[PDB]
């Protein structure tokens, strides 16, 4: 029997186009570009003929296909985008089975507990040297597949290491004073605790809310205030900010200002309720999904690759032109780009052993009760990999993208597959280079970039990360921000109202009774670059104007002050976009005798004002606990255990256990394995254009090869 | 009948044949056509067309009617271009007007025999009348006039003509003004050097066996109060030379320390400066791929089968909520005029006129052949005139529409530049997005309309994109590629004796070749009229202040707001961490905030940023060009102030540009303002940029700030 084509293909996730003039169906799904005519015996897949056992049947204007059409066509093999990995890469993320295995091992230990949850179950990284040997020399990693299992027993953190190869527990170490990150069930717990709170229902009622059932809560971390917040450091707590559900699908637009409940998770009870002046709840419906809007007619635009892609995905490894890298997923920081090499006329040269988001922070600047503690560490306290948002095909990524699925473990230790977790796509990016010599034939070549996009949503914010591999050796990393703003309810409707001045002291009035509290977005990227080898050095090149001492009319000249940065303490600094910073390899030079290097650019621009550092007086705790905020560039000695800027356990941390710690010993950075950390952010002062929903804003970072090659990288293969 | 592939490709259309569907897909600009052999109809942008003569296959070769192209492409089904019945007042001079203007000044008794024309452009009606035409369809009741700037030998004469009444209005000689470099000067220079016995000897001394292989370059000499020993009243050019070795890239073969000074009216070398002899780098370094083989790539196409979202009526472009006028000028190139944003039915003013103001590429080497090198590409050479035709699908995406533009050449003859400007829409990631936990996702794609122009002056190639976002934001990016000006040096690697001295002012990017450090400084003139003519300049500086509200916090994030009332104060460095708005104090949005536009002179770049001019304040180039040292300028609207580097910058003795326009320090309070953005880079070379440099970009932005009352792209309410 057969099934309706349109319905079935849509369900499948393929785009369906019917051309009445050509009596032709064009079907697109990732790397597959298919063409099929009703009644035809063969179809075309990426330019290649495919015999069909059952042709497409057109009945009374409706097409029907065999129940095998989707598999015969899309899994034919004519789409070579994906190839089966023969020799499993050592950096492959834990499979579902491995996840379940690690969980059975710890549950087999005499100490496991029933309520024991899992904050992170991830692969334990083999030694860097063995992995490179595999990627480069194809030498097998004879070290056992291990996995880190970080558990949360109530409010206590426990670190366990399991041996997957030999199915045995290798270690079980409790971590005192450490708090665990926020977990999914805590969200449900908070809303439930508030719904059962007699006092809170009372507090809410005195603030104009009749039906307390329509109150939506939000789980926020409290941070650390040396006790000034009057909060017991020992307890596992969360503060709660509420909004009113008006039925417009956007509760963020209806804040219940000056009301904050403090919830103790293990005690499952409200341990405190801070109240401030009663402010009428903004009631006007402000939907952002278009329900109240007119759909504008727009002409279609498709980016197509009818013969397939230029990249191939073997297991988790991606090959594209001269690039080769491994892409995996982590529940905390998200995507991880590993063993990145560039094929230089036959020789795979090392570039980056491991790169990924390091961590990020979004601190607000309002002193009031519902804002003073608000300083989010999204990846660290919430797990952005876990909160990945499936890519909306054709919208969140261009129509010529390939969408990958990724698997991680949820908090209960059960394997979780995230559909459309990461997007891969090549894109036209203007001319690679060009020169129109007067009176001569023109010379131009197009530029192509391979983009790896991942989106994670934590509450009201939606973050987008792109890892851009330029064909010419350059690597870009941009961060985009969109979503819904965290607003403050105020009495003023316009700037003409008596309270306007005070209501807008910490933010712009972007709507009637609504203020967009100023805050910042600070991202940090951990880049373990191995510029053509592990032993590198950090070099600085400051362009300067010096007095002319060679004669002639000129009084000055443009020269450069070049010097090495021998230690971590000095490598941790502000970035002047007017200067040049390089991670060179003092052991290898190019054809001209210059050390092969990569230029590090933490700030290549952005669409919001740039954050010159953390907008905090040097005496604020947040500024103290987290030092990665005030420096745009950091360089440390390679250590497999140092991966987070804010520290491994930032939830209510008392001191800096991250970059401040990784560099406190001020170690030598001369000709050794270095790790670059780039910090970049924006200072967000709101405007009406960003409400009810914010247009995507971007920040750009860059890694350019500096004398890494001997000439224009894209000139082409030498003919003679 | 006639051959299809042959005919269609002569037409410039792309032909594709799908044997499986027995279908031809024809593409050219806004036309996307589909036609099957033997079919009685065809499809043009989604619409059915009846054919007089079906396409016929003859020996596997398609054949079509001799009227096919016209019947199909000029059918009317391609709505990209529309007829302009009422000519916009800012339309550039037409070929007929260019010829009329030249006839008028030639009919004057003062017109001398070999006069050349530096510029023949439209003398624009008053701003008010123009805005009235775009907003109210009110006719501009003023005759079309044209400015005709002439160069009589070395003398500049400014004249004004009345095109509607065909009469000469004024004829004014300009004292002490030097004219820009004209194309024929390029040839004079090469020819003068060739006939120079002295030069040939000078060259022989340096190792060149055949002087006929010496390639010259016409370089402006600047001004040095005489310290360079050059007469101020003489029209001069310095000549740097290269050796043509047959690799199609003479730039890779510098003849270092040899500089000739040429007097254009006397037509001879009036001074030769010789320095240390350096052997000419000989190794072949072609950049055209003659010695290379490109890797095979799977095809990629960007298609709009139903046509474009934009309409081009004459020179007026309509796209979504945007409406603007695009014209061409021989000096600065593309001009974006009468820009409005259609806010739910009402067209609101955004920008009266915007265009490249001017630019400069100054070098940092003190030596004999570099110290005077400070190029004002548009001002001294005419970037519009030197526009480089866009290479379809390469310099611009495959879904672009290529426009032809017309300007006058130096002899006053109309000149049509093919594919002078590219217009294309592009996907720019999600416009906005929110994936609420456990709810249906909300995403919309972003679309930008890019207007791209490429100009090439000598070795450098410059790209300019005017980017219109659906949400009201306007972006302006400048890209740079081409061939680097290099210095000949003795060192082959950094291990040689002279290596350190050879690389004191630049990187050693190849054997015996150093890419001399320099800067790329662009300036944009933006006559913004934020929802009206009368505006003010407001500064908003984010600052950290002590907490006075109580609670654990010791500090807060606040904004320091204040108006900048005059021109001198408006001329300032730009801190990308601050906010600068051009507000309209007379209009507010629904929340009581002044409708405004955020000015961002520096939104990023792929090369190191130029925080100012890499020159001591006592350098002459520094004195002559103040715009290099400040990223933001705001002055009162004046029709005659259009160039940051001044109107006649060749060998100028003082600042006649932005330095002069702001000198008076006038009031910028609630009045017609003009914004000037200066953005630049400091370029320290590397091997990856030789023999040809990969395109490098810089970005600027203009964002609506409380101009609207909400997300501009949500759409109209049902
Ligand atoms: O994203 C930061 C913390 C948060 C989590 C869930 C809802 C709102 C805010
Ligand atoms: O682009 C600046 C001046 C110039 C003109 C022609 C050839 C080389 C250099
Ligand atoms: N007086 C307008 C210029 C002109 C001249 C000749 C033909 C058409 C137009
Ligand atoms: Ca260290
Ligand atoms: Ca390293
Ligand atoms: Ca203005
Ligand atoms: Ca003025
Ligand atoms: Cu923000
Ligand atoms: Cu340059």
UniProtKB/Swiss-Prot annotation, chain B:
Q: Where in the cell is it found?
A: Periplasm
Chain's gene name? tynA
Keywords assigned by UniProt, alphabetized: Calcium, Copper, Manganese, Metal-binding, Oxidoreductase, Periplasm, Signal, TPQ
Which residues are involved in binding Ca(2+) 1? 527-529, 672-673
Q: Where is the active site?
A: 377, 460
Explain the purpose of this protein: The enzyme prefers aromatic over aliphatic amines.
> How does the record describe the protein's post-translational processing?
Topaquinone (TPQ) is generated by copper-dependent autoxidation of a specific tyrosyl residue.
SUPFAM superfamilies per the record? Amine oxidase catalytic domain, Amine oxidase N-terminal region, Copper amine oxidase, domain N
The cofactor note reads: Binds 1 copper ion per subunit. Can also use zinc ion as cofactor.
Ranges where the record places region Disordered: 644-665
A GO BP entry:
L-phenylalanine catabolic process
Q: Which residues bind Cu cation?
A: 518, 520, 683
Recorded GO molecular functions are: calcium ion binding; copper ion binding; primary methylamine oxidase activity; quinone binding
**Pathways involved:** Amino-acid degradation; L-phenylalanine degradation; phenylacetate from L-phenylalanine: step 2/3
Q: Could you describe the subunit structure of this protein?
A: Homodimer.
Which residue positions does 2',4',5'-topaquinone occur at? 460
**Organism superkingdom:** Bacteria
UniProt name for this protein: Primary amine oxidase
Q: Name one GO cellular component term.
A: periplasmic space
* Catalytic function, reaction form: a primary methyl amine + O2 + H2O = an aldehyde + H2O2 + NH4(+); 2-phenylethylamine + O2 + H2O = 2-phenylacetaldehyde + H2O2 + NH4(+)
Annotated Mn(2+) binding sites: 527, 529, 672
Native organism: Escherichia coli (strain K12)
Family, according to the entry, reads as follows: Belongs to the copper/topaquinone oxidase family.
Where is the major localization of this protein? periplasm
A Pfam family this protein belongs to? Cu_amine_oxidN1
Regulation of protein activity: Inhibited by 2-hydrazinopyridine.
Cofactor dependence is on: Cu cation; Zn(2+); Ca(2+); L-topaquinone
